[PDB]
Amino acid sequence: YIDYKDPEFLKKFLNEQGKILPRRITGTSLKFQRRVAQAVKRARHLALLPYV
């Protein structure tokens, strides 16, 4: 369970523009990638990471 908190942890999977990196760029597997994307979007909703 990746927490929507720890935004500093969350930037590990983001690029310079704040977008979500593809699963092929890193080593993630599908379940972990889905959890990462969900956490990133939850934190964006909570205004913990920028939308742009």
Partner 1 sequence: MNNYETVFILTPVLSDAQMKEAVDKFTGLLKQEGAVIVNEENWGLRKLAYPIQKKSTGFYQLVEFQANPDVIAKLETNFRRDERVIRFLTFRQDKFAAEYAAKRRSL
Partner RNA sequence: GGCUCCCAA
Partner RNA sequence: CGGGCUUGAGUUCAGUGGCGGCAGGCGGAAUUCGUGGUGUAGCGGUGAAAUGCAUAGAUAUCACGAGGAACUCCGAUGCGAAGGCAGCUUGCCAUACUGCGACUGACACUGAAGCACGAAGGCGUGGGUAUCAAACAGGAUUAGAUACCCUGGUAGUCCACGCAGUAAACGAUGAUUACUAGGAGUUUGCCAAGCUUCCACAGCGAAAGCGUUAAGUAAUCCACCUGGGGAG
Query: Please, which residue, 8 or 31, has the CB nearer to RNA?
Result: 31
Q: Is 8 in the site for partner 1 (CB under 8 A)?
A: no
23 scored as a contact of partner 1 (CB under 8 A): no
Cα-Cα-Cα-Cα dihedral sign, residues 36, 45, 48, 18: positive
Gyration radius of the chain over CA positions: 10
Instruction: Give the whole-angstrom CA distance, residue 45 versus residue 3.
Output: 14
Residue 37, binding choice from partner 1, RNA, none, Cβ under 5 to 8 Å by partner class: RNA
Binding site for partner 1 (CB under 8 A): 1, 3-4, 42, 44-51
